[PDB]
Amino acid sequence: MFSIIFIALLILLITTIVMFLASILSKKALIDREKSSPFECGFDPKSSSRLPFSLRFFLITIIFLIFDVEIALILPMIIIMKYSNIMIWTITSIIFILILLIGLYHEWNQGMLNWSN
Amino acid sequence: MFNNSSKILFITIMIIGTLITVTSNSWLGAWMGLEINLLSFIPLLSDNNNLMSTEASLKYFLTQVLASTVLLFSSILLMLKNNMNNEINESFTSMIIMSALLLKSGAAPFHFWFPNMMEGLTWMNALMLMTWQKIAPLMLISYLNIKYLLLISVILSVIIGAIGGLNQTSLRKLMAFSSINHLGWMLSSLMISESIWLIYFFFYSFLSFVLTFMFNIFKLFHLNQLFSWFVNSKILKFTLFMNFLSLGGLPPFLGFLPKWLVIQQLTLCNQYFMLTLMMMSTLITLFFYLRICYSAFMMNYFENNWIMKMNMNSINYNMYMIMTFFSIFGLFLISLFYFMF
Amino acid sequence: SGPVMYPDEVTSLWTVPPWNSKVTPVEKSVRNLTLNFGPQHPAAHGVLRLVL
Amino acid sequence: MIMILYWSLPMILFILGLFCFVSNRKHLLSMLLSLEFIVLMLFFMLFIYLNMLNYESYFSMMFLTFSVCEGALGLSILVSMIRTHGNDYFQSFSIM
Amino acid sequence: MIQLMLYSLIITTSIIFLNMIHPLALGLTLLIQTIFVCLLTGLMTKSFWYSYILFLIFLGGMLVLFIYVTSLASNEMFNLSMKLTLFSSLILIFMLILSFIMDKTSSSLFLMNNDMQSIINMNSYFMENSLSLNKLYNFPTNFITILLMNYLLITLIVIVKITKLFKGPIRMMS
Amino acid sequence: SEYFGGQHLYQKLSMYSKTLFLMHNNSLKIYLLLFVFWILILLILLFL
Amino acid sequence: MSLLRSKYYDHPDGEDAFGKIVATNKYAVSAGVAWSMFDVLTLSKPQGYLPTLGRFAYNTGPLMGMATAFTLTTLVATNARGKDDKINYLIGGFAAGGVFGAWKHNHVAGLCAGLFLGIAGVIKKMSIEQGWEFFPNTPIKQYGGLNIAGNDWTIMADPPKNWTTEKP
Amino acid sequence: ISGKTMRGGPRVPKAAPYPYKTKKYSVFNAIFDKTSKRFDENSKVICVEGPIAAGKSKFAKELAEELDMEYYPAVDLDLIYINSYGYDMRKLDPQLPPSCRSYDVRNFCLDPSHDLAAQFQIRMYMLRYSQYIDALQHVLSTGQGVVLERSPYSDFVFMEAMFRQGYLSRGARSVYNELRQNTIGELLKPHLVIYLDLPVDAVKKQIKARNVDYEVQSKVFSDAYLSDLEQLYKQQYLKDISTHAELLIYDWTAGGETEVVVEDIERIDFNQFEADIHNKKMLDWRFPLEAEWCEARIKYCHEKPDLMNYFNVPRFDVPELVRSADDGKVWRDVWFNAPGMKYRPGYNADMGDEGLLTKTKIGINQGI
Numbered sequence A: 001m002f003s004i005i006f007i008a009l010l011i012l013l014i015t016t017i018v019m020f021l022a023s024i025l026s027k028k029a030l031i032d033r034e035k036s037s038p039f040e041c042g043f044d045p046k047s048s049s050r051l052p053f054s055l056r057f058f059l060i061t062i063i064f065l066i067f068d069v070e071i072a073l074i075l076p077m078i079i080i081m082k083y084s085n086i087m088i089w090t091i092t093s094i095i096f097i098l099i100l101l102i103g104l105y106h107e108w109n110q111g112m113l114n115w116s117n
Numbered sequence B: 001m002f003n004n005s006s007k008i009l010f011i012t013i014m015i016i017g018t019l020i021t022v023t024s025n026s027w028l029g030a031w032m033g034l035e036i037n038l039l040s041f042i043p044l045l046s047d048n049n050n051l052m053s054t055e056a057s058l059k060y061f062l063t064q065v066l067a068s069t070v071l072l073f074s075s076i077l078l079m080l081k082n083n084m085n086n087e088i089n090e091s092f093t094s095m096i097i098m099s100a101l102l103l104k105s106g107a108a109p110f111h112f113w114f115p116n117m118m119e120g121l122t123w124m125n126a127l128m129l130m131t132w133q134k135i136a137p138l139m140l141i142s143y144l145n146i147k148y149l150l151l152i153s154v155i156l157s158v159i160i161g162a163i164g165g166l167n168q169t170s171l172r173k174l175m176a177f178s179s180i181n182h183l184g185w186m187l188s189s190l191m192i193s194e195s196i197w198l199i200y201f202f203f204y205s206f207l208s209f210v211l212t213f214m215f216n217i218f219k220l221f222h223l224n225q226l227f228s229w230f231v232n233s234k235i236l237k238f239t240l241f242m243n244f245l246s247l248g249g250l251p252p253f254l255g256f257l258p259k260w261l262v263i264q265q266l267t268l269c270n271q272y273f274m275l276t277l278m279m280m281s282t283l284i285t286l287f288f289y290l291r292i293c294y295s296a297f298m299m300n301y302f303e304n305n306w307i308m309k310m311n312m313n314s315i316n317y318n319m320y321m322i323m324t325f326f327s328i329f330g331l332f333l334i335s336l337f338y339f340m341f
Numbered sequence C: 001s002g003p004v005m006y007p008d009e010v011t012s013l014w015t016v017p018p019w020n021s022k023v024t025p026v027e028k029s030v031r032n033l034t035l036n037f038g039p040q041h042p043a044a045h046g047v048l049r050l051v052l
Numbered sequence D: 001m002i003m004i005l006y007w008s009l010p011m012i013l014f015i016l017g018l019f020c021f022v023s024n025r026k027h028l029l030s031m032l033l034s035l036e037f038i039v040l041m042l043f044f045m046l047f048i049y050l051n052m053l054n055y056e057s058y059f060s061m062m063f064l065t066f067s068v069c070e071g072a073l074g075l076s077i078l079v080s081m082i083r084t085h086g087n088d089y090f091q092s093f094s095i096m
Numbered sequence E: 001m002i003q004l005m006l007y008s009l010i011i012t013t014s015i016i017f018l019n020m021i022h023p024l025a026l027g028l029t030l031l032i033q034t035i036f037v038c039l040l041t042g043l044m045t046k047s048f049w050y051s052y053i054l055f056l057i058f059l060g061g062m063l064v065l066f067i068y069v070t071s072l073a074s075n076e077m078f079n080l081s082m083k084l085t086l087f088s089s090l091i092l093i094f095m096l097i098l099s100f101i102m103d104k105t106s107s108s109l110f111l112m113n114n115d116m117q118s119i120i121n122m123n124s125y126f127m128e129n130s131l132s133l134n135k136l137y138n139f140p141t142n143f144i145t146i147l148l149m150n151y152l153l154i155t156l157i158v159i160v161k162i163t164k165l166f167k168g169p170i171r172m173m174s
Numbered sequence F: 001s002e003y004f005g006g007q008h009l010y011q012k013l014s015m016y017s018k019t020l021f022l023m024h025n026n027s028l029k030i031y032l033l034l035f036v037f038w039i040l041i042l043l044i045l046l047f048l
Numbered sequence G: 001m002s003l004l005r006s007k008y009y010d011h012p013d014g015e016d017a018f019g020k021i022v023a024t025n026k027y028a029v030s031a032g033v034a035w036s037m038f039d040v041l042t043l044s045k046p047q048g049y050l051p052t053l054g055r056f057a058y059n060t061g062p063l064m065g066m067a068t069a070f071t072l073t074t075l076v077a078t079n080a081r082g083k084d085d086k087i088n089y090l091i092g093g094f095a096a097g098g099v100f101g102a103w104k105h106n107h108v109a110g111l112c113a114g115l116f117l118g119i120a121g122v123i124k125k126m127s128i129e130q131g132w133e134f135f136p137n138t139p140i141k142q143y144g145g146l147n148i149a150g151n152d153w154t155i156m157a158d159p160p161k162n163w164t165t166e167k168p
Numbered sequence H: 001i002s003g004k005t006m007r008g009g010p011r012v013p014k015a016a017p018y019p020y021k022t023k024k025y026s027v028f029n030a031i032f033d034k035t036s037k038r039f040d041e042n043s044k045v046i047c048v049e050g051p052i053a054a055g056k057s058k059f060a061k062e063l064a065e066e067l068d069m070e071y072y073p074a075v076d077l078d079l080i081y082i083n084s085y086g087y088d089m090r091k092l093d094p095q096l097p098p099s100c101r102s103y104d105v106r107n108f109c110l111d112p113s114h115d116l117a118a119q120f121q122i123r124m125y126m127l128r129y130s131q132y133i134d135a136l137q138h139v140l141s142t143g144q145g146v147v148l149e150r151s152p153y154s155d156f157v158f159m160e161a162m163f164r165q166g167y168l169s170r171g172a173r174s175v176y177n178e179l180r181q182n183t184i185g186e187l188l189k190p191h192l193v194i195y196l197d198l199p200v201d202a203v204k205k206q207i208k209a210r211n212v213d214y215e216v217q218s219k220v221f222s223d224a225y226l227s228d229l230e231q232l233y234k235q236q237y238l239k240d241i242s243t244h245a246e247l248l249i250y251d252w253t254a255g256g257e258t259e260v261v262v263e264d265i266e267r268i269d270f271n272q273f274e275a276d277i278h279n280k281k282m283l284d285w286r287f288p289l290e291a292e293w294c295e296a297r298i299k300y301c302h303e304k305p306d307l308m309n310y311f312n313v314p315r316f317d318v319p320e321l322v323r324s325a326d327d328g329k330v331w332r333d334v335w336f337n338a339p340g341m342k343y344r345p346g347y348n349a350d351m352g353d354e355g356l357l358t359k360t361k362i363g364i365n366q367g368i
C-alpha cells in the first residue's frame, strides 16, 4: 500500500508534467475580451450557471445513498460462507435480499422511483 | 398515531429503539438504540403544511445528532482507558458521557433547545417528546455515579424551569418549562433510588398524559384560549382544572404522592439542602400553574358570545375522564400500591 | 393577550402566534434558468434560437 | 503520556469538527459536511478501539450504517426546509 | 515515516477544514481528509477491507451533497487568504521536520498488523478478512444484522414520508 | 415588609424571567457552542 | 502540588490567610468564569475581542472583591476576639454585601445582600461546627426494588457457569 | 359529470357506501376501507350561488335530482334555536338578558343596527362550516357528490355588505377576518360553482315575488346594499374561486330551466386539469395515493371536533361579541335548564326517551 502511494504520486507527477508541457508548447496569443466569455451557443447568457438548479431526483439520490450502505453489508459474505454455520448464513442472506426486494418493489408500487414532476 | 398507519409504524420503531437503548449492557448498543429512536422521531414532528414544525424537527435533529456524537466519543474514550463497559473510579470521560446524556434529556444548562423547539409542535408530539424521549437518556444516567455534575444539573434545572416559565403565555413553552422543572426532581431521585425515579416518572407521565388530552382535544395553544373555552357547565371546568394543582404537588391530589416519595427518599438518604432548594422551586411552578387556574376558579367570565356548543372526540374524551378522576381522587389508592416497600 | 406575560423593549415588537397551530407556507415567485438553444447547437439546425 | 502519544490526536480533530459544526455559518449544508467530518473522526477513534481487540472490527460497518442514516435524515430535513421556506439560511429560520 | 506524514497531512487539512466558509472547499477538504483517513485506518488492521468500505461510503455520500450544493448555495464567493496558506505551509514544513527528527518506533501505533502478529497464531494464516467479518453472519449477532435490515427499511420509509415527491422539485425560492 | 415580601418578590421574579427569556432569543448554534465549550473544558482537564 | 491546590478548611479558621484567599478566590473565579461564559455569548453580545474580556472582568473581578472582603473580614474578626463563632461570618457577609453595593451603586442591594450572605455564613458556620455536610455521599443507593435478581426476562438459555459457591 | 339521461338511468355506486353517520372512521378503520374505491365522475362538489332572491332552492333541488346528487340547502338559525326535540328556543327570551336574547334572520331584518347581528353573521359562518364538513363527509365516504345552496367561502361578502352599510364596526370585521383566516384553510375548495347573475332592481322585484312580511317591511333590501353584494361577489369572491373551480354564470332574469344548466356541465372536460400536478384548478381535490385519500377522509370524519374547536379564539376588545358574566350565568341557568337541552340529546328523559338504563351509545360528530 506504500508502493501504491508512491506510484499514485508518480502518476500525478507525470500527468502534471504532461499538462504543463501542453501549456508550455501551446500557442500564446493575446486574450481578447469576448474570447474568454462563456459559450452559451454563440449569444449572451442572461444568467450565470451559479443560478440554483432544480432537483427532480432527490428521493432517488437519498435512496441511492441508503442502498449503497446496504451494498456495504453484502460484500462480506463471500468469505463468510466457508467459515460459518450454513443455516445461519442462508437465513441472513436470503432474508437480506428478500427485504431489499420488498423495499424496492414497494417503492416501485408507490411510484417513488419516478422523478418529481 | 393520527391520519396514517405509517405513524403507527413509527411509534412501533420508537418503542423498539427506546427499549433497545435502555436494555443495553454496552454503551454502543445504547448509542445505536438512540440512533433508532432519532430515526423514528424525525418523521413524526414533520408536517409540510406547518412552517414551524419543520424548524422544530431541524432543532431536534441538530441537538440530538450533536449529543449522540459526543456520547459515542466519550464512550470510545471510556473503552480506551478503562477497557470494560463501565469505570471503576469516576473521571472526566464519565462527566462527558453524563453531559451528552443531559443534552438529550433537556436539563439545564443544556435546556435551551427544548422550549424553543416546543413552540413548533402539536400537543401529542409534545407529549411524546417530554415523556417517552426522556426514558432513554435518563435511564442511561443511572449507570454513572457522579454527584457534583448531577447536583449542578438538578439545581440549575429546578431554578431555570421555575423562573423561565413565568414569562411565556403560550401553553406549549410553559409546559416545556414545567417539564424542565419536573426533570430536576427526576434527576434528584436518580442518585438515591432508581425505583423512586421510575415512580416519579410514571406519575409525571400520567399527569402529562392527562393534561395533553385536555389541550389536544379542544386545541388550546394559548392562555386566553382557556378563558374563551366553552363548557356547558362551569362546575365541569372547575373540576377539569384541578389537574394543575395535582401537577403542582398539592395534597390530597395524586401528584402529591410522587413528589412526596421523592422527598421521603431524599431525607432518608440525608440530603436536605437541595431538597429545600427544590421546595422554593415548586412554589414558582405552582405560581405559573395558577395562571391557567385563573380560567376556571372565578366561576364566571366575560366570554365570547358566538360559540355555543363544545365538541370532542368519543374515545379520547372517554379515556381523558378516567384519568382526571384518578388525578384528583388518586390518594385513595395509597393502600393498593406495593412498590414503595 | 400579549406574546409574553411581561413585554420588554425587544420583546414587545413581536406579534401573537396564531391560534391555529398550522401556518401554511407562502407561494413565492421563482425565476427559472434561461438557456437558449442558440444557432451553433446542432439540434437547432444552424439558425434557430430557442430561448428555453 | 500514553494517552498523549496514542489517540490524543483524533480527540483534537473531533473537537475541531465540533467547533466547525457549531460555528456561525450561512448554510445548513456546511453543518452537514461538518457532521460527515465528525463521522470520519469517530470512525478513527472507534477503529482504534476495535483494532486493539483482534476480531471485533465487524462493528465498524454498523456505525457506518447508523451514520449514513443520520446523514440521510439530515438531507431529508434539508429537503423539508424547501417545502416550507425558499432557502436554507439559518438566519431565515425561526429563533423561537 | 508514512504514518507521521499522514498525521501531519490530517492536521493541516483539519486546520483548512475548520477555516472554510464555502461548501465546496469543505467538500474538497473532506475528500482529501477521507483519503488520508482511509490510508491511516488501513495501517492499523491486518487487512485493508474497512478502508475500502469507508471510501465507498464517503464517496456515495458527497455525490449527493454536490447536487444539494448546486441546488442550494450554488452562488457563493470564494475568498483565498494569504494568512491561511502561510499558516498551513509553516505548520506542514514544521511537522515534516519534527517527524523527520523523531524516533519512529515510539510514534508508531501499538495496534497489530498482519505481520506484527506472531508466527504461532494459526488464526493469522487464514484468509485475511474471514474471521474479522465472521460475526456479522454468526449466531450471536445475526439478529443485530436483522435489526440493521429493518432499520434501513424504516429509514427508507422515513425518507419517502418526509421528502414528498408529489410536491415538486426543490431549489432556492421554490 | 412588602419590600422584603410578596410584591417585591414578584417584581424580582418577573425581572429574572424577563432576563431569562432573552437567553432563549438566540439561534441554536450559540447553545451548541456552549455545549462544545463545556466538552472542551472537560477534555482539557483530562490532560491535566 | 502548589499553593493553588488548597482548601478553605485545611487549617483551623484564623490560623491561615493566603490559602483561604486563594481557595475562596478560586470558587469566585469558577463562578465568575462560568456565568460570564454563559453571559457573553447568550445575552448582550459584545461583538469584539476587547469588550468580551471587559465583560469577563466585569463578571469576575467583583466576585474576587466579595471573596477577598469576606475572607479578610472573617480573618480580622477571628484574630480580634478569642472565640470563634457565627457573627464573624455574619459581618463577613455584610462586608461582601457592601462590596455588592459598591459594585451596583445601590446601598439597598448592599444591605439586603449583606443580610443574605450573613445568613449563608452563619448556616455554613453551623455546618462546620456541628459536623453535618451540605452535600454528603449518599449512604442508601437503591439500584432497584425487590426481586432484582428474579426479573431476568431473557429468551436465550444460560450456559453452565465456571464458578461455584462450594469450598474445595 | 354525466347526468341521468346520458347514463341511461339512475346512478349506480362503484362500491358499497360507508355508514359515516353510524360507524366511526379512524386510522385503524383506514386499512380495511379505502376512500378512492367509490369515486367517479359524479363525486364532485357543486355550489350554486347568487343574490338574496334568485330561486336557488328549487334550482338546486332540480340539479340534485337530475345529476343524482345529495341536496344541501342553506343553513338557517332554526338548526340551533330548534333543537332535536322540536322545541323552539325563541320563546325563552323573557327570562334571558337583552344581550343574550334570540336573534335570527327576521330579527336582523326588523332591527339591522343591533349589536348581536354581527354575532349573527359570525354564527351563520359557523353554521355554513357545520354543513361543509357534512358535505365533505358525503363525497369522501359514500362517493356521491353534493350540491350546496351556499358556501362558507360565500359568507365574507355578507360581512363586508353589513360593514359598508354601517351595521358592523371595524372590530367585528377584524374578528370575523381572524376567524376566517383561522378556519377556511382547512376546507377543500368546491369543484364547480354556479352563479345566477341578476341585476340590483330585479332581485327587489323577486322580493315582491316572495311576499313575506319581514323582507318587505324591512330597510336592508335597498339599492346600495344589493349593489354592494353584486360588486363584492363579482369583484372578489368569484374571481378568487375561479382559480380553483369551474365557474358557470347564467342570467336568471327569466324563470330559466335546469336542463340546459345540466347539459352545460357535461361539455366541461374535468380530466384536462390532471395533466399538471401543480395546476391551480382542482388542486385541493387531487391525491396521488390512496393513503392521501384516506388521510383526507380521516381529517374530515374523525377530526370534525378539531375543525369546530378551531373557532375557539379569544377576542375581548370588542363590546358586541363579549357576553357579560352575570348575563352568561343567567343564560346558562335558563338555556341549559330548558326542556330539550337539559342533557345530551340522546339521553333526555323529559322528552319521552325510553331505555336509558342500558344505553351507552353516543353520536359521532354530535354537538353536546
Ligand SMILES: CCCCCCCCCC(=O)OC[C@H](COP(=O)(O)OCCC(C)C)OC(=O)CCCCCCC
Binding pocket: A001, A002, A003, A004, A005, A008, A009, E035, E038, E039, E042, E048, E051, E052, E055
Ligand atoms: C490522490 C489519491 C486519489 C484517491 C485514491 C483512492 C484509493 C482507494 C482508497 C483506499 O484507501 O484504498 C486502499 C488501498 C489499500 O491497498 P490494497 O488493499 O488495494 O492493496 C494492497 C497493496 C501493494 C499489496 C497491492 O490503498 C490505495 O489504494 C493507495 C492509495 C494511494 C493514495 C495516494 C495519495 C494520498
Ligand SMILES: Nc1nc2c(ncn2[C@H]2C[C@H](O)[C@@H](COP(=O)(O)OP(=O)(O)OP(=O)(O)O)O2)c(=O)[nH]1
Binding pocket: H050, H051, H052, H053, H054, H055, H056, H057, H058, H074, H105, H108, H121, H124, H150, H155, H158, H159, H215
Ligand atoms: N344578515 C344576513 N342575512 C343573510 C345571510 N345569508 C342569507 N341571508 C338572508 C338575506 C335574506 O333575508 C335571505 C335570502 O336567503 P338566500 O339569499 O340564501 O336565498 P333564499 O333563502 O331567498 O332562497 P332562494 O334563493 O329564493 O331559493 O337570507 C347572511 O350571511 N347574513
